[PDB]
Amino acid sequence: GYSDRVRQITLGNSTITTQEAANAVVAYGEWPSYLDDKEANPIDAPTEPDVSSNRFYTLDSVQWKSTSRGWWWKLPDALKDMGMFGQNMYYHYLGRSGYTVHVQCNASKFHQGALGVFAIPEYVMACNT
Amino acid sequence: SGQAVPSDVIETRHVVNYKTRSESTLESFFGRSACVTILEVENFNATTDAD
Numbered sequence A: 001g002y003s004d005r006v007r008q009i010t011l012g013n014s015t016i017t018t019q020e021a022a023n024a025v026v027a028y029g030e031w032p033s034y035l036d037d038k039e040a041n042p043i044d045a046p047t048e049p050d051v052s053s054n055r056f057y058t059l060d061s062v063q064w065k066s067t068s069r070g071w072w073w074k075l076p077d078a079l080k081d082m083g084m085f086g087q088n089m090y091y092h093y094l095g096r097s098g099y100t101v102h103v104q105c106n107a108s109k110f111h112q113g114a115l116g117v118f119a120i121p122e123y124v125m126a127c128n129t
Numbered sequence B: 001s002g003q004a005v006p007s008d009v010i011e012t013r014h015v016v017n018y019k020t021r022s023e024s025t026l027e028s029f030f031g032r033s034a035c036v037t038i039l040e041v042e043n044f045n046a047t048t049d050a051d
């Protein structure tokens, strides 16, 4: 019954379903986690907002056309204005976060096309002068 | 002097400190060859007291 194509993800008050997935990637084989005492740095008791902020936020959609060359976002930038995550981000000097990224694009059995979806650490880009 | 530390006046997490004061021991602080003077000498056929 269970399938590599069918998945549910629940975080906080939010749930995603998909019926045509292709497994899932865990970047570098490592699930996110909290910061251990033996690797800690700032000494103030941290805020851990948990369900208020650790939940799915859906960005404005973009349109894929035959002429599209692609899209980029940065993180945590893309979520800076998202509910309580954004508030916790901006009220503090320091923050860390992992992510579940879910990119959605359905069509039909008669459409064709392929999107590469990449998560890039330190995605530094060239300037235009 | 004042003695209070952060745990006395705020809520703190546990942070293990592995860092050491190795480079501020007196031996470390003074462990450098420092220039203390510049002397001058010459070699030539001297015919005056000054030379």
Ligand SMILES: [Ca+2]
Pocket (backbone or CB within 6 Å): A047, A048, A049, A050
């Ligand atoms: Ca909390």
Ligand SMILES: [Ca+2]
Pocket (backbone or CB within 6 Å): B006, B007, B008, B009, B010, B011, B012
């Ligand atoms: Ca305290």
Ligand code: NA
Pocket (backbone or CB within 6 Å): B016, B017, B018, B019
């Ligand atoms: Na220590």
